[PDB]
Amino acid sequence: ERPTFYRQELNKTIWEVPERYQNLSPVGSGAYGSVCAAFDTKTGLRVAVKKLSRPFQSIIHAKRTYRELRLLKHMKHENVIGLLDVFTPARSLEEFNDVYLVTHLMGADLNNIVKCQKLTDDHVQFLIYQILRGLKYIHSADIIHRDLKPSNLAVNEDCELKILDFGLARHTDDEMTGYVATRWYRAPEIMLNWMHYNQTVDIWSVGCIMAELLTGRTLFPGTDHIDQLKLILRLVGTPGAELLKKISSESARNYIQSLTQMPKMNFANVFIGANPLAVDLLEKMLVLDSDKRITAAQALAHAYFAQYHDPDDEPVADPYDQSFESRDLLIDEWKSLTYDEVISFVPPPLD
């Protein structure tokens, strides 16, 4: 590495980036840092360059920073966000304090394309197909997204989709109160912390997204946790003895049982006029018991994606080492590991 870095101040934010990145224009800011749009002269792509505020200000922040880089450094799939570059103007680990992440500039998210209508079956087939393809890859690496929602799905003009902003990072809390979309896509068990969730929590999310692409309406727009749980059970039915056994909190089990029992509803009478195939997949995705939900790899083989499925074009990931997740390190140690990951970044090829 080590090119020539030039520095400038845009929106009172200092940016020290290599010369390959030109014509930087602020495009977002916040506690996390700031994001810029720029032109990458070496790849010819319009990229987003994110400058992380002060990444090593606590053991938890330095950890989340290490986690983000590792995650992004690992993701190599067409339908998943990838890392184009990572740099720091620092010449040594001593002065290493700033981390910049560079990725393809994402324009519109799914929450724009759809919020503006109810789509055609072929569009739903395609968009959900890609979400599942990327999810098969992610899950195959033992990664659970945990926060799949329209706003976390970049979609271009050609209806090509990429899975973004991974949940794996920021502790699940704070912004899930009330009438908020940040919770309408969550599986009941992760939402009410009934049990230790598995990868199928992401599948429940795809179902919510898919159903919303078909009807043009939010499937479970609860005004709060309980109101949402209620909406869910009305459609999916209340838990039975088998699932109840798996809910660990005794008050949670006690609460569930205070509810009048309800049978699963007829989905064809909910998703009126939808491709029967779409209806069937939804029923296999929105299953209360996470253990009986369909897996991404299984969903891809569903007759609903007959027009796009090709087992030879749905790759899985290289093994992802998350041992660090259980490692007990000091800030400087998380900071050193991050630096190593930065220093060692090898760019994706141009072809």
Ligand X SMILES: C[S@](=O)c1ccc(-c2nc(-c3ccc(F)cc3)c(-c3ccncc3)[nH]2)cc1
- Binding-site residue ranges for ATP: 27-35, 50
- Looking only at residues 286 through 345 of this chain, which bind ligand X when binding is defined by CB under 6 A? none
102 near ligand X (CB under 6 A) = yes
Stretch that binds ligand X, among 87-95, 103-111, 174-182, 307-315 (CB under 6 A): 103-111
48 near ligand X (CB under 6 A) = yes
DSSP assignment of 250-266 equals HHHHHHHTTSPP-PPPP
Dihedral over Cα of 118, 122, 123, 127: its sign: positive
Q: Which of 24, 35, 45, 244 binds ligand X (CB under 6 A)?
A: 35
Look up 158 and say whether it is catalytic. Answer: no
50 near ligand X (CB under 6 A) = yes
Q: Which of 5, 16, 20, 32 binds ligand X (CB under 6 A)?
A: 32
Burial of residue 311, with CB atoms counted within 10 A of its CB: 0-12 exposed, 13-18 middle, 19 or more buried? exposed
C-beta of 35: minimal distance to ligand X in Å?
A: 5
Q: Which of 101, 201, 281, 296 binds ligand X (CB under 6 A)?
A: 101
Stretch that binds ligand X, among 101-109, 238-246, 277-285, 336-344 (CB under 6 A): 101-109
Burial of residue 242, with CB atoms counted within 10 A of its CB: 0-12 exposed, 13-18 middle, 19 or more buried? exposed
Quick count: other Cβ atoms within 10 Å of Cβ 12?
Answer: 8
- Binding-site residue ranges: 27-35, 50
Closest CA to 24 of 13, 37, 33, 34: 37
Dihedral over Cα of 205, 210, 211, 213: its sign: positive
Q: Which of 45, 106, 195, 252 binds ligand X (CB under 6 A)?
A: 106
C-beta of 272: minimal distance to ligand X in Å?
A: 36
Q: CB-hemisphere CA count at 13 Å for 65?
A: 33
Residue 78 identity (one-letter amino acid)? E
Residue 14 parent element (H or E)? strand 13-18
Stretch that binds ligand X, among 100-108, 175-183, 194-202, 239-247 (CB under 6 A): 100-108
Supply 190's token pair: 């992760």
Quick count: other Cβ atoms within 10 Å of Cβ 104?
Answer: 18
Dihedral over Cα of 136, 299, 166, 201: its sign: negative
Nearer to ligand X among residue 50 and residue 149 (C-beta):
50
Find the radius of gyration of the CA atoms of the chain.
22
103 near ligand X (CB under 6 A) = yes
Site for ligand X (CB under 6 A): how many residues?
12
Helices (H), the chain: 59-74, 110-113, 121-140, 181-184, 188-191, 200-215, 225-236, 241-246, 250-256, 276-285, 296-300, 331-343
Pattern 59-98, binding to ligand X, x per CB under 6 A? Answer: -------------x----------x---------------
C-beta of 103: minimal distance to ligand X in Å?
A: 3
C-beta of 236: minimal distance to ligand X in Å?
A: 31
Nearer to ligand X among residue 100 and residue 194 (C-beta):
100
- In the block, tokens 């520095």 appear at 7
C-beta of 152: minimal distance to ligand X in Å?
A: 10
C-beta of 85: minimal distance to ligand X in Å?
A: 8
- Looking only at residues 177 through 206 of this chain, which bind ligand X when binding is defined by CB under 6 A? none
Quick count: other Cβ atoms within 10 Å of Cβ 135?
Answer: 28
Contact 37, 310 (CB under 8 A): no
34 near ligand X (CB under 6 A) = no
Which of 165, 224, 227, 280 does the annotation list as catalytic? Answer: 165
Stretch that binds ligand X, among 11-19, 102-110, 188-196, 319-327 (CB under 6 A): 102-110
105 near ligand X (CB under 6 A) = yes
Residues in the site for ligand X, rule: CB under 6 A?
Answer: 30, 32, 35, 48, 50, 72, 83, 101-103, 105-106
Catalytic residue annotation: 165
